[PDB]
């Protein structure tokens, strides 16, 4: 009835739980950097101070904790320092200095070196008073890229949505447990607590409206995320100064690198990453590494929706069926956030079908 | 090992692989036990399409819908390629497309000729009591003649039956990680690399058996697949089956569980970076018998060897991990020269340097991983 090493926290899922906030005093000249980011780029002396850095070591990075909230400020300053003011003067040479700890670093986690949603999201952030419990008034980001880009708000509302889900993933031993054991009664009552999860995990998706602006993001934001896989403005992709002789192209921020929603996809034997089953595919390499491991384990287990069928027995159909419409609807609701932070900013498609092509393969895995 | 399907002593490989079908299947079986003749005479492609949209139901267990798997998959290549001379059809008949794509779909492998079905699932012993070498075995299936497909195919699988016996040992390595054997632990690890090398000793038989012009102009074409291939540049229409044309790559051994199964033990980070290798590799499990995907998964959700070693301080050990990589880079080494023999130089006489960099970055990062 529990999950191993795949870090995967009771409470909080997927999100690293009570992220560090501190480095040790030796990197003091990085996390002033990214503590200050806002401040740095409004000025112009974001470029010139990541310029006159030293190459520190990673080595004082003991722990797991700490080796992610450098990852994370690393990559905050990398995002800053690449895309500048976010007008134009893009930069496509990140500087040795950086370059090199930070790589050293991501290969260290097995990550990309670029900020990913495991980072942005799921190891930013804290709670204002330790003794209060887990909701956007107690909570705080650690790091944001400018004023008004309502990056509080956006990383926070995500986070929140992983946590509700959190409840739901450590139920899934139970379900397989009780496929195992044929406890039927037990298997309808776990499928039917995952639903129930789901559907909160939408209720609090709705709060995304009331903490971010969609001018704050589409306009801000959204660029300070972007990445360099087939990106125009670094079509080649970015050279790494002192780590890779050429350069090498890396996908910005997506919540397809979320394990939460691949892993229920996979669970309930919705088959997804059999082009956006490319894609979804591809953004797996971008989650931590016990979290793609925990992704593949579900796979090599046997199909729930397989065994519910055999069953003939509506009481299960209708739970499974609960679980299946839970993601329907999340996908849904989704699309009209996307409709109206993206879509609608942009008039002052194709993205639209690859959405809309994985909530209809959610929807088709329903038996009716 | 549980119900990964890794046999004791032939490792990925099916073990004593079907031969026949049941009668219900004549139709097809023919036309697989003939595929020489009938491309000589230019008429498998007519007996195809003079076929019956059969059932897979009859395939009742594991071994049979791997035969017919093979069966259909090597029917599918010589269709779609023909003589081999350029002329490629871009349809796949109704009758033969929906049962294969039924089959592919339950095993959960790609409609497409693989490794596992040439390679690991086509072959038998001449003599049941005699053991397992060229004299005695024989593959089941072949596209033309003087193709050298019995070598090529056999060839390669001894060189992974080679490798099943350095398998078997790993889950003695992890529980000695656990127990803290450090004895038990560096036993394991060379025995390993001595099955490794021994697995080169058996790749040295490829050049005995296999012609490089006769590999390179009939072989190579009949294993090539419609992914990012110009012949078939949209994919292949899969006629009652799917609405439009698919992409599949063809046969390669990046298909063989064995070598990325070796790398993931040893903390080889190959599947990880940006580039091209890593994606391909990646790639290429798709195409791996499901239960050999979830073994590699397995392996990749434990303990890193190459961490454990690090921490040690101990000669004795690093030596034999390094042995172990050592043998790898041995094998992809031995394995640049055979490319050389067989698709550079005779594609010589009618690129591929992008396509040795690619061969070569593996084995480099093979190399870097060495600890002295
Ligand atoms: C304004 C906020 C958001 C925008 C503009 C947005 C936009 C998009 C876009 C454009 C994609 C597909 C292409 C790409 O990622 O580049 C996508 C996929 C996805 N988004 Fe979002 N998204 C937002 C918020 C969220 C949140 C809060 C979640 C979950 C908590 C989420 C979950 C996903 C998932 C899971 C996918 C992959 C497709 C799928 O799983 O069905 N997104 N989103
Ligand atoms: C003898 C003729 C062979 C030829 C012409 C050949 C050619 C190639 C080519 C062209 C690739 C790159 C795949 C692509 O981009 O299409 C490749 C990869 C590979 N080949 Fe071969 N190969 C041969 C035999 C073997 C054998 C016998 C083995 C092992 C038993 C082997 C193991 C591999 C592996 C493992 C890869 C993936 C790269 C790696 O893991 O290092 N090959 N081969
Ligand atoms: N992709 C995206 N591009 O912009 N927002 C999204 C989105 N879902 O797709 N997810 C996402 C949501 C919040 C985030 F902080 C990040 Cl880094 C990624
Ligand atoms: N790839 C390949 N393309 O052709 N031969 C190879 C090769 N290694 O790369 N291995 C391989 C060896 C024997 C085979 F039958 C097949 Cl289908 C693939």
């Given at each position: 009835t529990i999950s191993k090493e795949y870090h995967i926290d009771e409470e909080v899922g997927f999100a690293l739980p009570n992220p560090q906030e501190n480095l040790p005093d030796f990197y003091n000249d990085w996390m002033f950097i990214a503590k200050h980011l806002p401040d740095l780029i409004e000025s112009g002396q974001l470029r010139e101070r990541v310029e006159k850095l030293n190459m520190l070591s990673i080595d004082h990075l003991t722990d797991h904790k700490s080796q992610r909230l450098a990852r994370l400020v690393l990559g905050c300053i990398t995002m800053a320092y690449v895309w500048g003011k976010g007008h134009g003067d893009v930069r496509k040479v990140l500087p040795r200095n950086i370059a090199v700890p930070y790589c050293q670093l991501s290969k260290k986690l097995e990550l990309p070196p670029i900020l990913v949603y495991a980072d942005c999201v799921l190891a930013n952030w804290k709670k204002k008073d330790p003794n209060k419990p887990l909701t956007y008034e107690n909570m705080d980001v650690l790091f944001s890229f400018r004023d008004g880009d309502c990056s509080k708000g956006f990383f926070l509302v995500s986070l929140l949505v992983e946590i509700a889900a959190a409840s739901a993933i450590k139920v899934i031993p139970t379900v397989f447990k009780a496929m195992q054991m044929q406890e039927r009664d037990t298997l309808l009552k776990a499928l039917l607590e995952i639903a129930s999860c789901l559907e909160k995990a939408l209720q609090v998706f709705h709060q995304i409206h009331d903490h971010v602006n969609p001018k704050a993001f589409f306009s801000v934001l959204r660029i300070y995320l972007?990445?360099?896989?087939?990106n125009p403005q670094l079509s080649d992709g970015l050279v790494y100064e002192g780590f890779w002789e050429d350069p090498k192209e890396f996908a910005g921020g997506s919540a397809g690198q979320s394990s939460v929603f691949q892993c229920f996809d996979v669970l309930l034997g919705?088959?997804?990453?059999?082009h956006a089953a490319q894609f979804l595919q591809d953004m797996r390499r971008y989650m931590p590494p016990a979290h793609r491991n925990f992704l593949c384990s579900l796979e090599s287990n046997p199909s729930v929706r397989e065994f519910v069928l055999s069953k003939g027995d509506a009481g299960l159909r209708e739970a499974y069926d609960a679980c299946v419409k839970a993601l329907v609807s999340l996908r849904s609701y989704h699309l009209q956030i996307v409709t109206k932070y993206i879509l609608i900013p942009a008039s002052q498609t194709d993205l639209m079908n690859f959405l809309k092509t994985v909530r209809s393969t959610t929807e088709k895995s329903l038996l009716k």
């Amino acid at each position: 009835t529990i999950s191993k090493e795949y870090h995967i926290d009771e409470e909080v899922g997927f999100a690293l739980p009570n992220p560090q906030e501190n480095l040790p005093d030796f990197y003091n000249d990085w996390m002033f950097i990214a503590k200050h980011l806002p401040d740095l780029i409004e000025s112009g002396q974001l470029r010139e101070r990541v310029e006159k850095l030293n190459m520190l070591s990673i080595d004082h990075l003991t722990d797991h904790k700490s080796q992610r909230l450098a990852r994370l400020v690393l990559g905050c300053i990398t995002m800053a320092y690449v895309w500048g003011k976010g007008h134009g003067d893009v930069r496509k040479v990140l500087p040795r200095n950086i370059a090199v700890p930070y790589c050293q670093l991501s290969k260290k986690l097995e990550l990309p070196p670029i900020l990913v949603y495991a980072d942005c999201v799921l190891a930013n952030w804290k709670k204002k008073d330790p003794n209060k419990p887990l909701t956007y008034e107690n909570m705080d980001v650690l790091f944001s890229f400018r004023d008004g880009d309502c990056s509080k708000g956006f990383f926070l509302v995500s986070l929140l949505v992983e946590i509700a889900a959190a409840s739901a993933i450590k139920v899934i031993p139970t379900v397989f447990k009780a496929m195992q054991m044929q406890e039927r009664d037990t298997l309808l009552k776990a499928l039917l607590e995952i639903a129930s999860c789901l559907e909160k995990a939408l209720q609090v998706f709705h709060q995304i409206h009331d903490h971010v602006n969609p001018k704050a993001f589409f306009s801000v934001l959204r660029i300070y995320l972007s990445g360099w896989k087939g990106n125009p403005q670094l079509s080649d992709g970015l050279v790494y100064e002192g780590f890779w002789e050429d350069p090498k192209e890396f996908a910005g921020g997506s919540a397809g690198q979320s394990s939460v929603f691949q892993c229920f996809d996979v669970l309930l034997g919705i088959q997804q990453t059999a082009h956006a089953a490319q894609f979804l595919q591809d953004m797996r390499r971008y989650m931590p590494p016990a979290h793609r491991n925990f992704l593949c384990s579900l796979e090599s287990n046997p199909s729930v929706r397989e065994f519910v069928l055999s069953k003939g027995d509506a009481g299960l159909r209708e739970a499974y069926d609960a679980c299946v419409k839970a993601l329907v609807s999340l996908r849904s609701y989704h699309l009209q956030i996307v409709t109206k932070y993206i879509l609608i900013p942009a008039s002052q498609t194709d993205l639209m079908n690859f959405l809309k092509t994985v909530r209809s393969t959610t929807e088709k895995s329903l038996l009716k």
